[PDB]
From a paper:
MYO-1 was encoded on a tet(X)-harbouring plasmid in Myroides odoratimimus, a widely distributed bacterium in natural environments. The structures of MYO-1 and ECV-1 were successfully solved by X-ray crystallography to 2.17 and 1.33 Å, respectively. For MYO-1 we found two molecules (chains A and B) in the asymmetrical unit with Rwork and Rfree of 0.22 and 0.25 (space group P65). Due to lack of electron density in chain B, the regions of N60 to K66, L93 to I96 and K104 to S105 could not be built. In contrast to the complex H-bond network in NDM-1 involving Ser69, Asp84, Lys121 and Ser262, we found different amino acids in MYO-1 (Cys69, Cys121, Gly262), ECV-1 (Cys69, Cys121, Gly262) and SHD-1 (Ala69, Arg121, Gly262). Compared with Arg121 (SHD-1) and Lys121 (NDM-1), we found a third cysteine (Cys121) within the active site of MYO-1 and ECV-1. These cysteines (Cys69, Cys121, Cys221) were in the vicinity of Asp120 (3–5 Å). The lack of Lys121 or Arg121 in MYO-1 and ECV-1 was compensated for by an extensive network of water molecules. Interestingly, this loop was shortened by one residue at position 231 in both MYO-1 and ECV-1. For MYO-1, the catalytic activity tended to be higher and its carbapenemase activity reached up to ∼70% to that of NDM-1.
Author numbering: 32 to 45, 47 to 100, 102 to 107, 109 to 131, 133 to 150, 165 to 205, 209 to 211, 215 to 228, ...
């Protein structure tokens, strides 16, 4: 089970295993309640890969400073899992620490369709990304359209860990925001994620409580 290793009004970090930490930050984009938004920190040999910026610059700086001063580590790469602001909201702060961004090509196109470009040159991938993190490996993979057309999934096999992002719901979630979604394909997409990760023990959805592969099952059935 999970240790809280950092907590503040702007940022919560939960330690789930020896290599896998969950970061939680809060979107306040309108005149209504803030919404909790999850990402994944993968740690190995004092090197860190982050799936999803926290929601803004100040939350992202709390995360970077936590990695530097408390995990005594370097962040070697940022992988935004799609183009919404619960994935790239703090991108400027990461770019200002010269953290390499790794992002899919469809994600770049949708960002550009929406008027945004990364400032620092990105490292781009079509469907699948393999990154070395010291002597272990971390992956991002595109399985199909869901929550958005570009959504990718993070995977660290050493701890059997999957960052579902917003393609994956928590147990008993509502459907949520569908403005950019492909509802005809969401569930077949997650069937593929399930097929690829039968031994997953840690599955982190984009919002709400993490758990096991039952998050896959629940999300498949939600959009059937
Ligand atoms: Mg696994
Ligand atoms: Zn989204
Ligand atoms: Zn989301």
């Amino acid at each position: 089970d999970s240790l809280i290793v950092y907590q503040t009004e702007n940022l919560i970090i939960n330690k789930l295993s020896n290599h896998i930490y969950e970061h939680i930050s809060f979107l306040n984009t309108d005149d209504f309640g803030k919404v909790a938004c999850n990402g994944m920190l993968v740690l190995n040999e004092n090197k860190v890969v982050v799936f999803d910026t926290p929601t803004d610059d100040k939350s992202s700086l709390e995360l970077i400073n936590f990695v530097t001063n408390t995990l005594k580590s370097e962040i070697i790469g940022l992988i935004p899992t799609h183009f919404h602001d619960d994935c790239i909201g703090g991108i400027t702060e990461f770019e200002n620490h010269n953290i390499q961004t790794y992002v899919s090509k469809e994600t770049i196109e949708l960002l550009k369709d929406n008027g945004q470009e990364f400032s620092n040159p990105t490292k781009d991938f079509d469907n699948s990304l393999t990154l070395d993190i010291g002597n272990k490996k971390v992956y991002a993979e595109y399985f199909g359209e869901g929550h958005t057309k570009d959504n990718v999934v993070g995977y660290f096999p050493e701890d059997n860990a999957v960052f579902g992002g917003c393609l994956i719901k928590e147990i008993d979630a509502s459907k949520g925001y569908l403005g950019d979604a492909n509802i005809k394909e969401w569930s077949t997409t997650v069937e593929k994620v399930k097929l690829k990760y039968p031994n997953a023990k840690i599955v982190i959805p984009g919002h709400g409580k993490w758990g096991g592969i039952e998050l896959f099952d629940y999300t498949i059935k939600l959009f059937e």
